[PDB]
């Protein structure tokens, strides 16, 4: 989906110097909303691989994909590629990379946290328009995961603070608005994770040679056509048309 791009730089004397990598047009809608016959990103399915029980037990991840809301909406699984050895190879590649394993644990736990935002539930107040949470075990475990406070997070989601003039005021949020806010937060955090990963990879690949004129290489998704075209397909087609 994402528009991978690689600029291969050269030296002053027309000799290979180093390479730079950038990403563009990463789609966030796939994270939350998936078509009926399509899957989500391979990350979540790979994480649910049972060959590593340590991650599942330390993240308190439910081994059943059906229970979770974000993934069960789309197709649960297909015989596309065996996720076990692919995940193992990705972990090995990260291990032989420049950064340590604490960071890998960080990405894994953050992905798990992204996974649990779907368990949030909210009930409209009986006497007020604003809606408050009903269950908090999922919120409690998630806040523990990020090292945040469950009460503070619930207050922020329910009662966002906004700056007006020179003073702070609280805003009211209903169930639909808080659900949209949670989805937007998940999409934004995933996008920031991907961008930070790309920057780290670029920094690791970077060598100390001078950067003269470069040669670009651009890979983009094609003009995909379905019988059930939707917003994501519209964006892809518009980019291809441009």
């Amino acid at each position: 989906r994402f528009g991978k791009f690689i600029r291969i730089h050269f030296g002053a004397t027309g000799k290979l110097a180093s390479a730079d990598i950038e990403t563009y047009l990463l789609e966030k809608s796939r994270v939350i909303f998936q078509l009926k016959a399509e899957r989500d990103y391979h990350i979540f399915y790979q994480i649910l691989s049972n060959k590593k029980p340590e991650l599942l037990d330390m993240l308190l991840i439910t081994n059943n994909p059906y229970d979770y809301a974000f993934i069960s909406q789309g197709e649960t699984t297909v015989a596309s590629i065996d996720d076990a050895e692919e995940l193992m190879a990705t972990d090995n590649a990260f291990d032989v990379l420049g950064f340590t394993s604490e960071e890998k644990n960080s990405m894994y736990k953050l992905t798990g946290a992204i996974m649990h935002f779907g368990n949030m539930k909210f009930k409209g107040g009986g006497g007020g328009g604003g809606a408050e949470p009903d269950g908090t075990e999922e919120a409690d475990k998630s806040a523990y995961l990020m090292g945040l406070n469950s009460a503070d997070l619930l207050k922020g989601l329910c009662h966002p603070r906004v700056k007006v003039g020179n003073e702070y005021v609280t805003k009211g949020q209903n169930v639909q608005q808080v659900i949209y806010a949670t989805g937007a937060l998940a999409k934004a955090v995933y996008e920031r994770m991907f961008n930070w990963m790309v920057t780290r990879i670029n920094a690791t690949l970077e060598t100390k040679q001078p950067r003269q004129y470069f040669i670009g290489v651009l890979d983009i998704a094609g003009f995909e056509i379905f019988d059930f075209n939707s917003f994501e397909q519209l964006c892809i087609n518009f980019t291809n048309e441009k």
């Binding site: 009930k123 107040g125 009986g126 006497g127």
Partner: protein
């Protein structure tokens, strides 16, 4: 004492809002049975009206 009163307020609001959702459910179900009672009442009413007209004719 301000903090003690804050704790008093918090568990008081918790208990009263639990009672509030309980009473909301109660009033909803009683309103449903109210509708059902009204429908059966009017059903019997006009059924008897029609049969009484049949009887008199």
């Amino acid at each position: 004492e301000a903090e003690k009163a804050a704790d008093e307020s918090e568990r008081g609001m918790k208990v009263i809002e639990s009672r509030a959702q309980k009473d909301e459910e109660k009033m909803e179900i009683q309103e449903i049975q109210l509708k059902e009672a009204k429908h059966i009442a009017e059903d019997a009413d006009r059924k008897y009206e029609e049969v009484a007209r049949k009887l008199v004719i």
